[PDB]
Amino acid sequence: ESAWGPAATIAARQSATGTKTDTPIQKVPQSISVVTAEEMALHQPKSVKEALSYTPGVSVGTRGASNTYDHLIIRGFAAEGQSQNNYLNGLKLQGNFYNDAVIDPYMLERAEIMRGPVSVLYGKSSPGGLLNMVSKRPTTEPLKEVQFKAGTDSLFQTGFDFSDSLDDDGVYSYRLTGLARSANAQQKGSEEQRYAIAPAFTWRPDDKTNFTFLSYFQNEPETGYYGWLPKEGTVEPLPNGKRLPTDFNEGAKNNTYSRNEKMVGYSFDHEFNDTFTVRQNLRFAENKTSQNSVYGYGVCSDPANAYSKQCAALAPADKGHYLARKYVVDDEKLQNFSVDTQLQSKFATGDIDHTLLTGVDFMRMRNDINAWFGYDDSVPLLNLYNPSSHHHHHHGSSVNTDFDFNAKDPANSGPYRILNKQKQTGVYVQDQAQWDKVLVTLGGRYDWADQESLNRVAGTTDKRDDKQFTWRGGVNYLFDNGVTPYFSYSESFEPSSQVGKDGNIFAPSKGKQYEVGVKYVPEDRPIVVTGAVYNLTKTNNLMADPEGSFFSVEGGEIRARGVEIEAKAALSASVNVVGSYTYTDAEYTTDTTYKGNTPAQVPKHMASLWADYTFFDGPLSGLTLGTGGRYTGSSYGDPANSFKVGSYTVVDALVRYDLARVGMAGSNVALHVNNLFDREYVASCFNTYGCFWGAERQVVATATFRF
């Protein structure tokens, strides 16, 4: 098993996103999870987001039923500005504003998650949090796969995955993966459209040299729903005592959202001799996205709408059941270049073996934003009264009316046009020195993160050049019966894009984490079990001005201490089990307005358990039956901890049948169901006017053939 390849079992022993060198999990001084292709091909996730429903320390409901972005909250933290923090092949997919890229899981070999500070190897990043996806590479043996999906809400997906060798020596091999997916969003009027293709080329001139070309091209005409719903009508009842239905949509009938992705790059490694090996990863991508979206703000009786004219002009007792809305028109285009070059030197020092990693990482991102935002009264109000029993059960919500978007009244709307530039360069050194059973991992990295923002309207230009250093040290007492105790200190840094009162760009916030735990990686049985307890602190978090002044102020602090236990196994040739528990104590340590309060959208308790049985026996030979559930404790729906989103428990099921009994061994047909008990829940609220209905039970039938 290679950190950059398949795992054979639901349990991956090898990973390289934690130390940038192919290391076995037990030897990694940090909480690392790995969701293999197998596991993913088990639930047929819609996005890498869903593919993470069972991993501990990651909420995936930050946006409810919506999938526009694989935005995650890890260990109670996320990137600033609703941005993502996702890596693809050890390189970051640096996004900006609404321009953030996604990779379809069907194109991944595995999706890894690294918890806690990760700057020691990746540069600027949101504390405690990082997702690293691995492109599918050319396979060792022929692969001619064709897959067909069909599910609820008009879901239709047709995709292929072919990999072969051009020569009988395997010096030349490829892999072409693509898919065409179409579906209706949970919210009436909204659609989901995707076309993706990933071309890979691997050149192995010998057994010590590999250069694999990695490209990805994707087109999405419409990305689906991405709107906000009030706590009143979702979490809490509306005055009349009813609630907006889970399929309710508050946007224009002509709301539109598109994203365009294009990328070329490569992964290269070369072993010069018994001590020196070099590997370099490079990628270039130009990404576009645009939208015409009318989103809802809060109900008229919501503080946010305090200054709303359309709202104020209502009977004081009606403000509580009328929805106020705004809108945005956006169109962006960004390019991002990335290359990481590293050198791995293997040498000893009498009983002390060394694995020295030293490399230089570079990246630049440019994004051009040309958009328009509607402010108060920019769009008609909405009477939430209508959504009743005719809109619930019998049929459902109804699409509203069109909106202008064009003719932006200089009154209720204005222009937004920015040119954001980002540059980062870092050099790092790490060493995994094993002195028999005692593995010590230590290393660090220095960074040159420079940003430059141009406001095409104000004709302004804000700049900032950061120079940050981070290191990480850890110890793993490699036992022999499997158990592996480990502890480690880690650091991170995340620059700010916000400008203070002094007209200058804020300084970067920082992450510090203390984690200790044990990992059981038995060498005989294919089972992995890890548990960990940590104390992660984000510092210099921006907070309200002590003297309220529109401008924020740095110096705030947030602490997240919690426990995480995960377990994936192969208890049998017919038994597989995935399970995890997550305890999260996230609290505002220092903050002008909030404090003691816990950040919104982050539950205290989380747990998930899953298992599947397979048959090779009786009449049910080739049958795989699996079910499971995911637990999401209660959470706060706003910074003020004003209200709370209730806990919920969703169940997933799986019936898989091997088609061997039709001469099609290898292939198979399966039925997947998410939220079996079609539970109605509110995933979360980032504020009183920003709540998201969870996903209504979905059902998918999949036919995946192997020629």
Same domain assignment for residues 548 and 665: yes
Residue type, 374: G
CA dist 261 and 107 (Å) reads: 14
Q: Name, in order, each residue with C-beta under 8 angstroms of 379's C-beta and a sequence gap of 6 or more.
A: 252, 294, 325, 326, 327, 403
> Coil, strand or helix: which one is 26?
helix
CATH of the domain at 30: 2.170.130.10
Phi, psi of 261, rounded to the nearest 5 degrees: -125, 135
Strand partners, 645: 635
Torsion angle of the four alpha carbons 234, 235, 241, 242, in this order, in degrees rounded to the nearest 10: 30
Specified resolution (Å): 3.0
Q: Which of 84, 89, 88 is nearest to 73 (CA)?
A: 84
CA dist 539 and 514 (Å) reads: 14
CA dist 600 and 587 (Å) reads: 10
CA dist 599 and 536 (Å) reads: 14
CA dist 360 and 341 (Å) reads: 5
Say if CB 667 and CB 706 are below 8 A apart.
yes
β-pairing verdict for 86-88 and 131-135: parallel
Same domain assignment for residues 120 and 157: no
Last residue of a domain, one of 94, 111, 142: 142
CA dist 556 and 591 (Å) reads: 5
> Coil, strand or helix: which one is 658?
strand
Same domain assignment for residues 431 and 563: yes
CA dist 269 and 506 (Å) reads: 39
Annotated binding residues: 63, 82, 97-98, 226-228, 295-297, 373, 695
CA dist 319 and 560 (Å) reads: 38
Q: Which of 282, 421, 285 is nearest to 361 (CA)?
A: 282
CA dist 161 and 108 (Å) reads: 11
CA dist 302 and 656 (Å) reads: 48
Same domain assignment for residues 531 and 636: yes
Same domain assignment for residues 392 and 431: yes
Phi, psi of 334, rounded to the nearest 5 degrees: -135, 155
Torsion angle of the four alpha carbons 550, 554, 556, 558, in this order, in degrees rounded to the nearest 10: 100
Q: How many folded domains does the chain comprise?
A: 2
366 sits in which H/E element: strand 352-383
Q: Name, in order, each residue with C-beta under 8 angstroms of 511's C-beta and a sequence gap of 6 or more.
A: 77, 116, 117, 119, 126, 127, 128, 490, 491, 492, 493, 494, 536, 537, 538, 539
Q: Name, in order, each residue with C-beta under 8 angstroms of 237's C-beta and a sequence gap of 6 or more.
A: 243
Same domain assignment for residues 82 and 122: yes
Q: Which of 277, 464, 419, 260 is nearest to 355 (CA)?
A: 277
Residue 646 per-residue DSSP state: P
577 Cα distance to chain centroid: 23
Q: Name, in order, each residue with C-beta under 8 angstroms of 658's C-beta and a sequence gap of 6 or more.
A: 621, 622, 623, 624, 665, 668
> Coil, strand or helix: which one is 171?
coil
What are the strands, taking DSSP E only, across 55-154? 58-59, 73-74, 86-88, 91-92, 108-114, 131-135, 143-151
Say if CB 291 and CB 310 are below 8 A apart.
no
CATH of the domain at 587: 2.40.170.20
Q: Vertex 47, ends 41 and 52: CA angle to 5°?
A: 75
Say if CB 292 and CB 258 are below 8 A apart.
no
β-pairing verdict for 108-114 and 73-74: unpaired
Q: Which of 115, 163, 120, 122 is nearest to 139 (CA)?
A: 163
Q: Which of 305, 297, 228 is nearest to 691 (CA)?
A: 228
Say if CB 277 and CB 270 are below 8 A apart.
yes
Say if CB 691 and CB 637 are below 8 A apart.
yes
Secondary structure string (H, E, C) spanning 443-506 = EEEEEEEEEEEEECCCCEEEEEEEEEEEEEEEEEECCCCCEEEEEEEEEEEECCCCECCCCCEC
Say if CB 694 and CB 246 are below 8 A apart.
yes
432 sits in which H/E element: strand 413-434
Phi, psi of 431, rounded to the nearest 5 degrees: -145, 130
> Coil, strand or helix: which one is 695?
coil
Same domain assignment for residues 156 and 130: no
Last residue of a domain, one of 97, 120, 142: 142
Q: Name, in order, each residue with C-beta under 8 angstroms of 129's C-beta and a sequence gap of 6 or more.
A: 72, 73, 74, 75, 77, 78, 79, 85, 114, 115, 116, 118
565 sits in which H/E element: strand 551-569
Strand partners, 365: 336, 422
Q: Which of 336, 335, 339 is nearest to 281 (CA)?
A: 339
CA dist 669 and 149 (Å) reads: 10
Same domain assignment for residues 158 and 60: no
Q: Name, in order, each residue with C-beta under 8 angstroms of 620's C-beta and a sequence gap of 6 or more.
A: none
The CB density around residue 487, as the number of other CB atoms within 10 Å, is 18
> Coil, strand or helix: which one is 39?
helix
Same domain assignment for residues 107 and 232: no
Last residue of a domain, one of 88, 117, 142: 142
209 sits in which H/E element: strand 209-220
Same domain assignment for residues 331 and 284: yes
42 sits in which H/E element: helix 37-43
Q: Which of 512, 515, 518, 559 is nearest to 534 (CA)?
A: 515
Same domain assignment for residues 277 and 180: yes
Residue 239 per-residue DSSP state: T
In terms of C-beta density within 10 A (0-12 exposed, 13-18 middle, 19 or more buried), how is residue 622 classed? Answer: middle
CA dist 417 and 333 (Å) reads: 12
> What's the token pair of residue 197?
């293709």
Structural domain that includes position 114: 1-142
The CB density around residue 98, as the number of other CB atoms within 10 Å, is 23
Secondary structure string (H, E, C) spanning 289-325 = EEEEEEEEEEECCCHHHCCCHHHHCCCCCCHHHEEEE
Same domain assignment for residues 236 and 334: yes
Q: Which of 142, 145, 146, 144 is nearest to 165 (CA)?
A: 142
Query: How close are the terminal C-alpha atoms of the chain, in Å?
Result: 24
Annotated binding residues for ferrichrome: 63, 82, 97-98, 226-228, 295-297, 373, 695
CA dist 248 and 245 (Å) reads: 5
CA dist 357 and 18 (Å) reads: 12
CA dist 652 and 671 (Å) reads: 11
